[PDB]
Amino acid sequence: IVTKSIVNADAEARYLSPGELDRIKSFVAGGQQRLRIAQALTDNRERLVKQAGDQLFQKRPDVVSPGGNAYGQEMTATCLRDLDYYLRLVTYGIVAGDVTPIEEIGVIGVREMYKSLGTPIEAVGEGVRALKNAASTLLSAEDAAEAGSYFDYVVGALQ
Amino acid sequence: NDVVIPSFKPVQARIQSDKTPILAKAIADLAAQAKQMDKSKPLFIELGRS
Ligand SMILES: CCC1=C(C)/C(=C/C2=NC(=C\c3[nH]c(/C=C4\NC(=O)[C@H](C)[C@H]4CC)c(C)c3CCC(=O)O)/C(CCC(=O)O)=C2C)NC1=O
To answer: Where in the cell is it found (chain B)?
Structure first.
């Protein structure tokens, strides 16, 4: 939240506002809890990714259908690696407080990419929604609100 | 000959704690703080509390 506040006060000619300095103070105060949430999500990488991908294949069997993109062991391994990448970017966004790491690493040009790869966008989005549900079940309650709202940004930005 | 001031009679107050009405508002607000969802721990343990 420091980069966004600095560039927002950079667009104007003035310094950082007292409101924005309160935002940075509150972000520092919540930063240790955010590191705890990142600790839990780092250590639960395997089973979260596998449960979310298998929930996706329960919801959407078109990708693992033989006409689909994720047909075969190697293709489905790359599917789970894509879900791993998005969970990693979600942890980065939970730590930073911005969504600029999520955005400029994995959001900004993903539609044209998955159009050229032949992969449907909505199934990626359903898999990240499954990640949101799984990480919501793992964490503490309003902590899961925090994690699932960054997950919610990723889900709404993919579609 | 009679004693002028024998002692000091202790006098009781006419307000104990029921007034002072945000000590009293705090009794209420905090008594009702206990039974509102308290989101700090997982959510599944907090639907099963009577
Ligand atoms: C960190 C940001 C980031 C993303 C998102 C990313 C995706 C990505 N997905 C790929 C393939 C793939 N991606 C999928 C994805 C899916 N199967 C489905 O049906 C679902 C909708 C979806 C799972 C979410 C599949 C099936 C392939 C293999 C397609 C192919 O090999 O042609 C490839 C090419 C092979 C590779 O290098 O792994 C990239 C680069 N790369 C990145 O750096």
So the answer is: Cellular thylakoid membrane
